[PDB]
């Protein structure tokens, strides 16, 4: 599951992913985290 700290960070993550750049790297660049479970932590609810 991808979990982002802010709406703008989610927007940056979606932009970074558009050309195909790997989710793990886009998460690093934007501050989003990729976790194994279904429910995002409350500070990463966007």
From Swiss-Prot:
* UniProt source species: Crambe hispanica subsp. abyssinica
InterPro entries for this protein = Thionin (IPR001010), Thionin-like_sf (IPR036391)
* PROSITE patterns assigned to the protein according to its UniProt record, in alphabetical order: THIONIN (PS00271)
* Subcellular location, record wording: Secreted
- Name the Gene Ontology biological process terms: defense response
Q: Which family does it belong to?
A: Belongs to the plant thionin (TC 1.C.44) family.
Q: What is this protein called?
A: Crambin
Q: Does the keyword Secreted apply?
A: yes
Keyword Glycoprotein found: no
Corresponding gene? Answer: THI2
Its function, per the record, reads:
The function of this hydrophobic plant seed protein is not known.
What additional remark is attached to this entry?
Two isoforms exists, a major form PL (shown here) and a minor form SI.
């Amino acid at each position: 599951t991808t979990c982002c700290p802010s709406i703008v960070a989610r927007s940056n993550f979606n932009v970074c992913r558009l050309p195909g750049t790997p989710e793990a790297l886009c998460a690093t660049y934007t501050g989003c985290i990729i976790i194994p479970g279904a429910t995002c932590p409350g500070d990463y609810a966007n």
